[PDB]
Amino acid sequence: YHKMYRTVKAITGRQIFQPLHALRNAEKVLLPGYHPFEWQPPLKNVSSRTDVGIIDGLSGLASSVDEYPVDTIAKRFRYDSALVSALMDMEEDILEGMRSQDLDDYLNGPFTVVVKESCDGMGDVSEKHGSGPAVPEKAVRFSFTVMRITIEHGSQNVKVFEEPKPNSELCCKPLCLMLADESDHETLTAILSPLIAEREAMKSSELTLEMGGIPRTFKFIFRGTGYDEKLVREVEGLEASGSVYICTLCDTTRLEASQNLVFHSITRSHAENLQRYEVWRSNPYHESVEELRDRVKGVSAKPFIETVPSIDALHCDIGN
């Protein structure tokens, strides 16, 4: 780019492109950790320093020899700062959206923002032309997407912004990257747990920002739907695949699923799953193993991530 800039600057005489330091300032205005903001609740267990960028994903782990070994490399953003920078990015669009929906350019909040939540591993990333097989080298991202923004006036709410392509590649902003296996359980939860803590601290807070020359206030709502099947059976605490328990919503066995076809409901939730795991720990009625296995409906591990599951049409008609 420096070559192209200097060659066109020489051949035209005019400086049509820009040099590199201006490019660095133009990218420093768009990273996380630049604009100021505050929160109306003071956000417990969160450092309120407001100019942090790429931080180490391990949150200060314990990489000494005398500790449990972990050789993964994880880099992350703080959650609030990335959310702030995403809102400051979509500032002009939300301005013209609320103009187009027949309202004023001056309007205080609260804007309520509904956010897609996702995670996925990307398999192999190694490039070895020879030297035998080098390394399998599995890695995984953790990302989010602003799905919709809404606002009320008095009692009448209005969808002020909707996104046209939800699952596309150009709207999946990443929080954290780590070079680790998807099923390597303890490293995965050990890196992902502080972002969960930041999310649950953020759930009951109020953001205040200064986008359109005037302050705005924000609440938030998170939908953990962007997971795949093997991962949602792994990180919620269910059996992997070989159980009699196949439904991630209803507790219908494989026996009853062939028998009863449609007459079920949705009966799985997070707090009851925590309670079921506590039942599995305590074993209050001193029963045998199999009756616990059918009493808890496949609950084996401690749940630690809230997740509302869904499907996609490809799996539907391919099963058909």
Added chain:
Amino acid sequence: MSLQMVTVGHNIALIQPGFSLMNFDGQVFFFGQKGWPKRSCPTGVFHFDIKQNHLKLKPAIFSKDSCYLPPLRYPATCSYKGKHQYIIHGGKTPNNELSDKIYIMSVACKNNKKVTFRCTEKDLVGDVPEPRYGHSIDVVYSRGKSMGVLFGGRSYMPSTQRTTEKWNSVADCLPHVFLIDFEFGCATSYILPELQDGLSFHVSIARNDTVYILGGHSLASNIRPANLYRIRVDLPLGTPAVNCTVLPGGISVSSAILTQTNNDEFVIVGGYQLENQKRMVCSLVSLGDNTIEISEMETPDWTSDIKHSKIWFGSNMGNGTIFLGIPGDNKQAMSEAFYFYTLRCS
């Protein structure tokens, strides 16, 4: 004093650094698997059995009245001969939380060479210790009455001193010892003037009047304190008496393993002396009525596969046999990432 290479069963991945080897009548069981329990084993404890230097991890089930428990990755444990059973408490969850519950493993029944267990847990009243790992628990007797003596390891920051970017950083706990009755769950912290800072992965010996400490790593100044400790306990009719003395002759070691070879006669395998170099030489110890004296062995030969590596781990199987492992070499790129050796001391 004899290295033996071991061949392995099919389920290698259930092993992990920071395991638990338990022993009952010479029969040895594995605890502390990797991940979470599966459909194959609903508990996580296995018949750790070896023939012709060949191991097989084959499952073990519980009783009806047992209590279920997750695998714990760095707990403390001790023998309880009062019948016979084990006392385990502390540890780290698979999801990297720290519990503070005291589980009791008792053998429920054993019939036709198939054995079951009777796991119960016990909580405490009063001066409870904070949840931790790398700590040490020992049982000691006096006047025929038994009492469990504890010494802390390390933990997280408390809830006020914890933030996002430092959510996983650790710190040594306060240097207190706890006196734990198992008839009621009475717990009492004690403040000792000779003791200075925290300590982690120290080696703990207890013989019937006085518990001995050795080695370990102090996070507070990132050194290994090279001073041992001799902790005298007395339990009279009234309040119990705790006493500590400082003796010379401590060896600067961390994360070693103890083993009973003969009666009142124990031995020490090599752990770590610096965090850049592995500690190669291994040591003995010998106890009398009140004396304590270290000793060094005839530096038993390793493979070069050990001598070219970086780290290890391990524990003991009880009967004078150290079982330990080693991460493989991923440079050759044809490894199962773990090899294992058994070190008979005899």
